[PDB]
Design a protein around this ligand. Structure first.
Ligand SMILES: N[C@@H](Cc1ccc(O)c(I)c1)C(=O)O
Ligand SMILES: N[C@@H](Cc1ccc(O)c(I)c1)C(=O)O
Lengths: 308, 308
C-alpha cells in the first residue's frame, strides 16, 4: 500500500484522486480539518484524527482548526466557554497521538481582510445553496437564523486563508466543500470520511444525540454500550458494531468463542468478517464481545493519558 | 411651530414621538441617515436631506453615511467605484446646503469589533425576518444571495456603532429599524420619510427605475419630465406632481393661469391646493406649469453650485 492508498483507506470519497496524486509529489503539503468544540470526543472524531495521522505519515503538515467562531454561529454557546472546550479537545487529539498545529478560528476569522472575503463570497453564494450546505450541520432550529448561512461561507474561506492543499471532513461537509471548490481561486482536494451510525441504529452518531462511545469511556461503559447496541444477525448495513470492526480494529482478528459454539475464529480481514457475519456464521454476541475488548485496548492509551 | 413640529412636518412616522421629545431636551444629540451611493441624486434624496437640515436646525449634529459596503452587499458594483459615486453624492449633499460629518461605511464596518457584533446580531435575527426587512431594498435577483441577509444586520449595527439618538430613512427602511429597536441595548428614535411616486405613476421613485427628477436636471429637462408625468384631474393619491407641491414648494403659491381659464390663483397652503385640485377647479396643465417653474427655482442654486 503506497501513500495514496494509505490515505484512501476507509474514506468515503476523495475529490479528486488525480488532484491528490499531484499534491503527494510535493515536498511541502498541508491538510486541515476543523471541529466545532465538543464536550465529549467520540469515535467519529477519532476516525477523522486517524485519517489526519495517515496524512501526517504521508508527509503532510497538519493543521487542526478548533472552530470556535463556527460553533458560536451554530449556537453552541458563548465564545469564552466554547474556547475552553476547544482547549480540552486539543488535549484529547494530542492523546490520540496527533502532533499538529492547533489554531482557533477566532484568532483570524474576524480580521478585516477575512471578513471582506466572506462578504465577497456572500455575493456569490445563494441563500438556497447555503442552507442546503448546512442541512447536516446546522443546529435544529424552528426559526433558522442568519448565522446559519454565514457559517458555510466562513468555512469556505478557511481553506483559502490557511492555504492548505487538502481539507478533510466527514461526508456532512461535502456540500460546503463543493461550494469551496467552485468559488475559490485554488481548488482544495477534499477527503471525506464516512459518517458512523449511532449505537442504537437510529441515525448518525452525534455528540448531541448521546449515541456514541467516547474515547475516554471506561472499559465497563464501553462494554455496556456495545452490549445494548443495534446489531441484527446477518445485517451489516447500518450496523454500528460492524462499522467499529471495519474502522478501528486491526487484523488478523481473533474472536473468542466457546467450542460448543464453533470455537475461536481468526479473521484475516474486515472483508472476511463481513462475509462470516452476513452468512450468520458469527453471532452478534461474539462479534460484540470481540469488538468491545479490542476497542477497549485500542482506546486504553488515550484514556490513560487523559487521566494521568 | 416648535422644533418637534418642525421635525415632524412631512414625515410619515416617528418612532416614537415621546422618545423624540426626550431627545430634544438634550444639549447634545445626533442623527444619521445612510444612502447607498447613487449615480443621480433625485428628489427622494433631497426630501430626506431637507429633513436632516431640519434636524440640524433643531440642534442635532448630523452624520451622513455614504453606505458603500451596503451598496457592495446589495450588488451595486466594486467598492472602489462605489466609493467614487459616494464622493460625488457628498458634493451634491453639500450643494443642498447640508453641512455634516460624512463617513464611508467601509471605514469602520469591517473592524473586528463591528464584525463580532454583526455575528452576534445574526444569531438573534431569523432568516425570514431579515429577508422580509429587505423586500423594498434588495436588488432584484432571481437567486437571492447570502449578502442580502447580511445587509440588514450590518445596518442595524450602524446605529449602535455611531451612538446616534436618531436614525432617519424612507419608509422602506422601517422593518430594518424595527429590528434595530428590538435588538439593540439602546432604542434609536426612527424618523421615516414618505416614499415619492415615480413620474409615470407606476410604483415608487427610484434611481434604478428612471422615473425621477434629479436635482441637477436642466430646467428644460424638468419641464419635459413634469409635462409627461402621471397627473389625472382630481386625483391626489399617487400623483407625483401633487407630491412635489406638498414636499418641496413654499406657500403662498401663485399659480399663473390665463384669465379665460380663471386667472391667477394664490393658494396659501398645500391643503388648499389639494382642495382645489380634488374639486377639479385646477387643471393638471396649470398645476404642472406652476410646479415645474417653482421646482426649477428651488433647484437652481444646487445645479449652479454643481456646475460651477
Ligand atoms: N463544519 C465543521 C466545523 C468547521 C470545519 C472547518 C472550518 O473551516 C470551519 I469555519 C468549521 C463541523 O461540522 O464540525
Ligand atoms: N439601506 C439604505 C442604506 C443604508 C442606510 C443606513 C445604514 O446604516 C446602512 I449599513 C445602509 C438604503 O436603502 O440606501
Amino acid at each position: 500500500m503506497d501513500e495514496f492508498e494509505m490515505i484512501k483507506r476507509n474514506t468515503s470519497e476523495i475529490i479528486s484522486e488525480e488532484e491528490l496524486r499531484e499534491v503527494l509529489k510535493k515536498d511541502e503539503k498541508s491538510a486541515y480539518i476543523g471541529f466545532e468544540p465538543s464536550g465529549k470526543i467520540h469515535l467519529g472524531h477519532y476516525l477523522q484524527i486517524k485519517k489526519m495521522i495517515d496524512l501526517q505519515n504521508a508527509g503532510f503538515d497538519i493543521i487542526i482548526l478548533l472552530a470556535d467562531l463556527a460553533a458560536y454561529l451554530n449556537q453552541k454557546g458563548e465564545l469564552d466557554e466554547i474556547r475552553k472546550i476547544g482547549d480540552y479537545n486539543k488535549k484529547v487529539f494530542e492523546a490520540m497521538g496527533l502532533k499538529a498545529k492547533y489554531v482557533y478560528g477566532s484568532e483570524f476569522q474576524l480580521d478585516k481582510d477575512y471578513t471582506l472575503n466572506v462578504y465577497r463570497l456572500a455575493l456569490k453564494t445563494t441563500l438556497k445553496r447555503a442552507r442546503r450546505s448546512m442541512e447536516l450541520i446546522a443546529r435544529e432550529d424552528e426559526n433558522p437564523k442568519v448565522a446559519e448561512v454565514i457559517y458555510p461561507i466562513m468555512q469556505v474561506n478557511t481553506s483559502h486563508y490557511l492555504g492548505v492543499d487538502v481539507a478533510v471532513g466527514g461526508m456532512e461537509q461535502r456540500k460546503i466543500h463543493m461550494l469551496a471548490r467552485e468559488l475559490l481561486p485554488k481548488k482544495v482536494v477534499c477527503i471525506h470520511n464516512p459518517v458512523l451510525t449511532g449505537l442504537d441504529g437510529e441515525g448518525k452518531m452525534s455528540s448531541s444525540k448521546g449515541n456514541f462511545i467516547a474515547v475516554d469511556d471506561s472499559p465497563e461503559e464501553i462494554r455496556a454500550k456495545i452490549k445494548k447496541a443495534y446489531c441484527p444477525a446477518g445485517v451489516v448495513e447500518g450496523n454500528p458494531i460492524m462499522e467499529i470492526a471495519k474502522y478501528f480494529l486491526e487484523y488478523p482478528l481473533t474472536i473468542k468463542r466457546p467450542e460448543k459454539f464453533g470455537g475461536d475464529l481468526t479473521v484475516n480481514s474486515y472483508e472476511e468478517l463481513e462475509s462470516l457475519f452476513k452468512n450468520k456464521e458469527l453471532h452478534p454476541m461474539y462479534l460484540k464481545n470481540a469488538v468491545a475488548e479490542e476497542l477497549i485496548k485500542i482506546l486504553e492509551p488515550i484514556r490513560k493519558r487523559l487521566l494521568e
